[PDB]
Amino acid sequence: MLDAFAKVVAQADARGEFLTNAQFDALSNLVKEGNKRLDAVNRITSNASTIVANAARALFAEQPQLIQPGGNAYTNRRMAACLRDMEIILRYVTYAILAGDSSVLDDRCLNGLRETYQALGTPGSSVAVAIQKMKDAAIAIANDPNGITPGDCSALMSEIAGYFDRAAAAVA
Amino acid sequence: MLDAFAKVVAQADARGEFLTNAQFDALSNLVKEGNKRLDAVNRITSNASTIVANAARALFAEQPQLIQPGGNAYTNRRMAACLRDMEIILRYVTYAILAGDSSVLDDRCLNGLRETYQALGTPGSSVAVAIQKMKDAAIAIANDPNGITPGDCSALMSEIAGYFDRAAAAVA
Amino acid sequence: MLDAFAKVVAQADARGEFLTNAQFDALSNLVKEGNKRLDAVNRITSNASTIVANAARALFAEQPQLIQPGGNAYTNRRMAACLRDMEIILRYVTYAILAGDSSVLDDRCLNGLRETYQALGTPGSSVAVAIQKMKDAAIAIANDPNGITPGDCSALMSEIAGYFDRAAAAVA
Amino acid sequence: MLDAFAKVVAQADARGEFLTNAQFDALSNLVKEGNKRLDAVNRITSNASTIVANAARALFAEQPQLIQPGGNAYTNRRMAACLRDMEIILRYVTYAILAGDSSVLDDRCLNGLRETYQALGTPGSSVAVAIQKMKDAAIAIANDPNGITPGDCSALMSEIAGYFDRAAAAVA
Amino acid sequence: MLDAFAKVVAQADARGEFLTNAQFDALSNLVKEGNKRLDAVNRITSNASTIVANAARALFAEQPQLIQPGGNAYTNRRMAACLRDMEIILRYVTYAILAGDSSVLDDRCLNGLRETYQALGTPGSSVAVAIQKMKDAAIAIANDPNGITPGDCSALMSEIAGYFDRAAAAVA
Amino acid sequence: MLDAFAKVVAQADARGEFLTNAQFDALSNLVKEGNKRLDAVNRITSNASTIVANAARALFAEQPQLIQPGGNAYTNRRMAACLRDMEIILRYVTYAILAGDSSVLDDRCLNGLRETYQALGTPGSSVAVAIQKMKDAAIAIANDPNGITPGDCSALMSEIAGYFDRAAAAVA
Amino acid sequence: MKTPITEAIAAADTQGRFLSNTELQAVDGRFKRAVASMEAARALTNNAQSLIDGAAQAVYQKFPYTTTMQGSQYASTPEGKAKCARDIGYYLRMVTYCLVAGGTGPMDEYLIAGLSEINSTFDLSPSWYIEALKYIKANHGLTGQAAVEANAYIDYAINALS
Amino acid sequence: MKTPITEAIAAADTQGRFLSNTELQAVDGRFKRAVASMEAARALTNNAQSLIDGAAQAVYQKFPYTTTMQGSQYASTPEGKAKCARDIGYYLRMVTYCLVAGGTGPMDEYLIAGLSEINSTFDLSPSWYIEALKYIKANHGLTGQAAVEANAYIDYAINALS
Amino acid sequence: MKTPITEAIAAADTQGRFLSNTELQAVDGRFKRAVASMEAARALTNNAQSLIDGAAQAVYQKFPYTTTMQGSQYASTPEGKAKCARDIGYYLRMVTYCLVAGGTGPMDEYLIAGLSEINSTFDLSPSWYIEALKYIKANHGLTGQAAVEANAYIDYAINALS
Amino acid sequence: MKTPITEAIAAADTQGRFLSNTELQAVDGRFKRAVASMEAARALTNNAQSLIDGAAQAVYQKFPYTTTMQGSQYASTPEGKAKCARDIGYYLRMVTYCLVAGGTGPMDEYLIAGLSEINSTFDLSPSWYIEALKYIKANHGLTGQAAVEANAYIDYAINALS
Amino acid sequence: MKTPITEAIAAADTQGRFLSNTELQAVDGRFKRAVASMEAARALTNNAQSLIDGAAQAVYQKFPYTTTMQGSQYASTPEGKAKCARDIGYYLRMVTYCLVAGGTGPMDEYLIAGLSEINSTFDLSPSWYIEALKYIKANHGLTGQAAVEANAYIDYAINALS
Amino acid sequence: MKTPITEAIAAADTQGRFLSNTELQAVDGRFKRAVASMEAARALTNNAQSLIDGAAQAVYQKFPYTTTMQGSQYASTPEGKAKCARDIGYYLRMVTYCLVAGGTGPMDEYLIAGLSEINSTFDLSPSWYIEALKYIKANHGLTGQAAVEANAYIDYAINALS
Ligand SMILES: CCC1=C(C)/C(=C/C2=NC(=C\c3[nH]c(/C=C4\NC(=O)[C@H](C)[C@H]4CC)c(C)c3CCC(=O)O)/C(CCC(=O)O)=C2C)NC1=O
Ligand code: NA
């Protein structure tokens, strides 16, 4: 996997080039915005259980056929697996927030996941809905103005939203 | 794998339903016919070696090209493997007789077996003939009226014939 | 794998036949030419490092894009792997010289190697060129008239050339 | 492992002897008492959780130093392991009740268990006390006259007590 | 393994106690001296090869019987293993410098190492001499006043010397 | 393991010495006697089954308590293991004949074998007797003057006897 | 799914053997016991509704705070009460399935796998379901070996929750 | 040793579980069958000597060359005949052990393991022992489920030799 | 025990490497953060008793049935109340240990391993301990990065119970 | 297939090495021995028919019951005699293949693998084939190292049957 | 690629955990150090050409035989000198990449993997590249923590060549 | 140690087999070649001193900087020259051992294992030892198959250094 810094390095090596000043400048701003990134990870991680449970509750309220007998989330084994998947997707999204790059998410979570759910008969569009609900809770928690030095985190919330939408697109 | 009882249960759970009286009645008759099923398994199993050897003898008598040099049953390694396969198919058929359901046969023996023989160059239609010969011997042994409380086992012999024909169809 | 002797045996067994006099004669000449075969292996093997290094030098001189940044042999990991591959192909070719048959080369080296290089993005035609250069050095070394009982090794050099051309065709 | 029947067989084979009538008679009474044995296993097993939890509660009430900081059952990892051990000993004792012989208990549970606890610093005499408490609860449950065909199970309760005392001696 | 901080915690938990002010104060000074510790590790690590090679050179100069035919460091396999051991001991000593505690050194390097060398016939006292030579070079490098903010590192050099002497005692 | 040639080399390397003329001469005679050694191996190996079976027959004739019920060779599993052991010892002895040195026998067969039989309750002195009987048959077969170029193999038969006596001493 | 019959087969199949008399006796044991099991399963099925309604109330009686406390995990709304009744019926239905199949298989696969993860996640107390199960056990009205049968699987669930 | 009881335990132990009703039904199956098995074992034990003497002769009748041909593997000496009778008694004794234990275990451990290595090594023909076993089967004089029981283990030996 | 320092070492040791600059930056990160962590740990330690007493009452307020219901798992006896206070102090003490060590290690080893087995066995509800932990979080009185630090480990316990 | 040449290669390939002088000496050993082997193979091939006919009769002489006893495993019909002659020719043909290849490979792959399963299944006695092989050995008429060569592979078959 | 950030993630991912405060402190350590690293990387990049030209000459000065001796491995032709300058620039470029990424990753992946195989194959002496690296180290002109940073990765290369 | 004889044994032992004719031909190959090998080994041993002295000078001639440059790795002191002569004699001695044993074994075990680690650590250039070895090869004065033999093992060392 790559972080934001290693990605610039790998692109540079392919051309056999030292970094430019534009690239150094871009990477410096990445470092100057680092405190915000650490808060976002800390906050989303610190509320991981409620994000999952509350999103799952909402999903089953809107799609009751999932929990009816014969549904894909009926039985405790299937429910456990469903909640587990939500936890995993969230986990890998937080990894990508820390690294500032989606490679870890794409490579270790999303590659082949659509195919996985198709073989099982798990409705991918239902999974997408679960991810979208976790997204909306995560951004509300991460971007909460209470209990933190005030400032603008909007470009980071855009980036965070980017990682969630990528995962929802990957399964749907 | 499922037995006859677990199959009714799994169908019921998919609908979220308690068993009906029709289902209870059907399962009770299954139990009342259980002594016959145990005799059939005991008898076929107790004669396993002669069933195999006698069927193989017959097969090679009718299809000599199998044992000619260059034939698929020429050499002791290939002959051993051929007899082994006949033993295995018989074994799994007896498993399905005991359970009253083909799942164990289908899942652990027959799935992918046609493809296996096609990759090897083993003639599937010759295998089918070997199975049909074991079938005819097995039913004669299982349904022999000597040395047993008289009664009607015809519906069970139908079922037994069903498992053999399924295996012969699976390879041909 | 087969050597030249085991191949004649396997063809014979498929027909269920004792060897003919023609086959015995052919195999006797194989044995009478055995000293030449052992020299060829000894000589090619004894110069294995220079064959590889000198062929690689030549390849990178003619195809500099391979070693430019972004090239498939740029970075020491990729260079190492490239030289390793050349060593491996040479090794397996020498195995086939000893055995008098290509089965070991085909089975353990060449099968699936085109597909391997296509998945990686390694240019197969560049690999072919590397093999052709090792071929030309190997035959010059093996067929050097200095320091050895004089005699004709031309049919063996044809055979050796055959194994190299087979490998170059397999990747291109 | 041996059951009561296999033990008589193994003793007989060592002498090369057919069973006597005394041995056949002894084994027949074993079978005639089998319903009682099945009740005892069913009852002890059906109450497995309360036997363990209630014995552990009692142990920690009488030996508080076990749960004080620095005690061998302080921390949840050590408590879990302690309760686990109690469950295991109970499990293996029930195995021996079913088989009518201690071999499974001795061989798979007790062999080397004193040495295990000595290396860890776990007080063996405390473990013995835990087993003795499970024993007293198990016999009260197994020998409860409510809800069962009346009759005498005293020789079986002696045997059950035998298996518990053996385990307590093995660790102390 | 423990670091200096986890060791205080583990001692505290055994008594079931919150940390005192004395312990908090001690741990604060540990943190305030942290820059010095990081320099020492960086410096010793950055010169790892010369420390080893120069110590080994010296050892073989003073104990030539080690490299004479039949000596324990004669042959390249035995020499390689000898140099490897020196590298390993150095590595684990640097781990303990970073952690501020010997547990990692004791547990993963030194436990059983005397016994290891006795079974092999490797002279432990020669190993001790090699360690003592690495110690003297390491402290000279780590405590070099050139190219660094001036200040007193004497208590840290004492600690570093402590880890080397511990390893030399462990093998001798 | 060592052969006779590698043993001289290893002794030489320990002193850091080129071979003397005495050593070269000794090794030359080893080579000149090589045809005899190959006959001895070929002959003993070619009669391996009768050596074992005939020795075992004799052993059980002289020590009937081994095959009585409760005996260490009673039951087919124990008999099989007994015959297997005899085959193994013979096999490893033939390895040492080929190599001209006992290292392979000592290292891979005899080390720890006394301890093995003591833990099992297998009478080592009975095993010794079995080996002595195989020895006497092996030398009679190997030194049979019929069907071979006449000459003196007495020093080789001494050596062969040496390997058998070593194995018998190792278990007794 | 785990039954006496699939266990007998699994054993043989694992060791690459035909069925033996060892395994046939096991399956006969199951066929003979089936009469007591089917009696139990039938009675529990016929009386299902009253047993579920009675059991839910037993729970509300023992833990009254479950009908008053705010939160989706509790039965203080119509929705919460309906979910509670549903779950209790699931438990009862699984017991009837065990009785029919002659083993724990159905409960093992459909209820017990994942159970502690579910209860932990949705804040469902095991002791609620134990109380429900103890009510069914005390009030199923079965006697003799039918009671032994039904109680064996009910108590199996209880140990899974304990 | 393989019995219905040790199999029931092995299953539970392998999965780290207490015994369940799944396994208790298996052992009850064994206890109920024991009456037929013990009848068979007793009758075979009481009539052992005549069955062994009859069986050996059946073998000599079928394969007369075994009483004439030179070699220690054959019964053409007093010693050879005594070894033959011994072996046949071993077979019969193993059948009675199976009957008593309720499974193949005793025969599996004491006779079948190593069998083909023994017969191959000492040049003993399996078909000699099959004939001996077929005689016992035809002439044990048991009826009903006692015969079913004894025949199951005799035929088990026959398949092991085939 | 898991700290930023033992993690840095484990990484290097696993790959057979000396420490690199990769790992030294990690440990410097820990040394700089230690000032905020030690502030948090000190304040929580000095105010331990009031935080424990306040937290227990928060639990009794939220779940009043814990002070009334019969059973050794509840706080309806002096013994039960003392066990409850003890446990809550254990939680707080573990948080101070995490703060001091710069990682989850102490809580991971001494509290979280085995937790769900303990709570299941003694019938202890996780939601009791969550409420206790939320009280400490709301009332520790820390600000800035000391609060961030203490809250990180408190919330870590909460997710372990959820 | 196992020959001195494929063994030399397998060794090198297993250790990822080029061929060395270690392995070239092995193959030269094979080339020099080939003269004795080819002599043996040629003579056995030219005299194949008389050796097969003689060998079958040797078997019928030693075991006369094979020509009289009813059953498809015996040579008491034209079909049985033809199958017997066929098998004996298979044995001889395999020996000539070993001689040509310089190793056991051909016999190992085409005859010995599965042998004991075949003989056990069709009730074929190993001692029949040993007698056939001993006849060929006594009457092949080879001398010197050609006899050593042919006898090595014949005796190899005998140990496989023993 | 190995950085303080991917290491923090790998640790968590390996144990199936969310990121903890353990790992966040590690990444903060990296962010704070980045100022010294970027200073070093920028200065080395801006002065790259003079450092490469100076370093190559340092090598030719120390090992004069490299400019005189015949062979493609040496710098006694224009082509050889250009290859030498290229390689030295590769080394310097890798150091700047390490500085930017905050770890050894870039050098580990693009230069050190395969290094000893390359040097062995093309007859390139490690001590040439050590001398080049020592020149850069003595003459980069950085001070304070920027020098510490650049020297850490230069010395890392030196140990890889030693 | 790797010889044609231990290889023949290892093969058999690995597959649990007795030695076959496959393996005996390999060992005969070795016995026949031994005459050429022993001739080579004897001549190299008798002329050892002149070959070592000549070879060291060949190295000093090719790489004159080795006699002038300061450092313990070079031969610019009496001690350095004595170490160089020692090493060259080690190489020659290993070749004679290979010749005697009939394989690479002695060189593999005593010289090649660890070689690249040693040369890397003490800054010893492989090309020094290649030049020494090429001198011995050109000037050993052997002809025919004795030269083939000695050259095979010398060239083996060269590829190990390349
Ligand atoms: C699925 C496993 C299984 C069980 C659990 C089982 C139990 C079982 N135990 C029985 C009887 C019995 N059970 C007991 C046992 C006891 N009575 C007492 O008063 C003692 C306190 C207690 C000690 C255990 C007695 C005395 C009998 C009657 C005698 C007998 O049939 O053995 C019976 C006979 C029918 C009946 O009496 O109701 C059965 C079916 N059978 C099975 O197949
Ligand atoms: Na037992």
UniProtKB/Swiss-Prot annotation, chains A, B, C, D, E, F:
Binding of (2R,3E)-phycocyanobilin 1, residues: 82
CDD domains to which the protein is assigned, alphabetical: PC_PEC_beta
InterPro entries given in the database record: Globin-like_sf, Phycobilisome_asu/bsu, Phycobilisome_asu/bsu_sf, Phycocyanin_b
One biological process term in Gene Ontology: photosynthesis
Gene3D superfamilies (alphabetical): Phycocyanins
Positions where N4-methylasparagine occurs in the chain: 72
Binding-site list for (2R,3E)-phycocyanobilin 2: 153
SUPFAM superfamilies registered for this protein in UniProt: Globin-like (SSF46458)
Post-translational modification (record): Contains two covalently linked bilin chromophores.
Top-rank taxon, per record: Bacteria
Chief localisation class: membrane
Record's subcellular location: Cellular thylakoid membrane
Annotated S-S bridges: none
GO cellular component, one term: plasma membrane-derived thylakoid membrane
Record keywords, A-Z: Antenna complex, Bile pigment, Chromophore, Electron transport, Membrane, Methylation, Photosynthesis, Phycobilisome, Thylakoid, Transport
Membrane topology value: Peripheral membrane protein
Described purpose of this protein according to its UniProt entry: Light-harvesting photosynthetic bile pigment-protein from the phycobiliprotein complex (phycobilisome, PBS). Phycocyanin is the major phycobiliprotein in the PBS rod.
Subunit and interaction comment: Heterodimer of an alpha and a beta subunit, which further assembles into trimers. The trimers assemble into hexamers.
Protein family membership: Belongs to the phycobiliprotein family.
Name of protein: C-phycocyanin beta subunit
Species of the source: Thermosynechococcus vestitus (strain NIES-2133 / IAM M-273 / BP-1)
Gene: cpcB
Swiss-Prot record, chains G, H, I, J, K, L:
Alphabetized UniProt keyword annotations: Antenna complex, Bile pigment, Chromophore, Electron transport, Membrane, Photosynthesis, Phycobilisome, Thylakoid, Transport
Chief place of localization: membrane
Post-translational modification: Contains one covalently linked phycocyanobilin chromophore.
Highest taxon in the source lineage: Bacteria
Matches recorded under SUPFAM superfamilies: Globin-like
Cellular component terms per the entry's GO annotation: phycobilisome; plasma membrane-derived thylakoid membrane
Subcellular location: Cellular thylakoid membrane
Residues that coordinate or bind (2R,3E)-phycocyanobilin: 84
GO biological process: photosynthesis
CDD domains assigned: PC-PEC_alpha
Database matches in InterPro entries: Globin-like_sf, Phycobilisome_asu/bsu, Phycobilisome_asu/bsu_sf, Phycocyanin_a
Membrane topology: Peripheral membrane protein
Function: Light-harvesting photosynthetic bile pigment-protein from the phycobiliprotein complex (phycobilisome, PBS). Phycocyanin is the major phycobiliprotein in the PBS rod.
Similarity comment: Belongs to the phycobiliprotein family.
PANTHER family, alphabetized: C-PHYCOCYANIN ALPHA SUBUNIT, PHYCOBILISOME 32.1 KDA LINKER POLYPEPTIDE, PHYCOCYANIN-ASSOCIATED, ROD 2-RELATED
Assembly behavior: Heterodimer of an alpha and a beta subunit, which further assembles into trimers. The trimers assemble into hexamers.
Protein name: C-phycocyanin alpha subunit
Species this protein is from: Thermosynechococcus vestitus (strain NIES-2133 / IAM M-273 / BP-1)
High-level lineage: Bacteria, Bacillati, Cyanobacteriota, Cyanophyceae, Acaryochloridales
Gene name linked to the record: cpcA
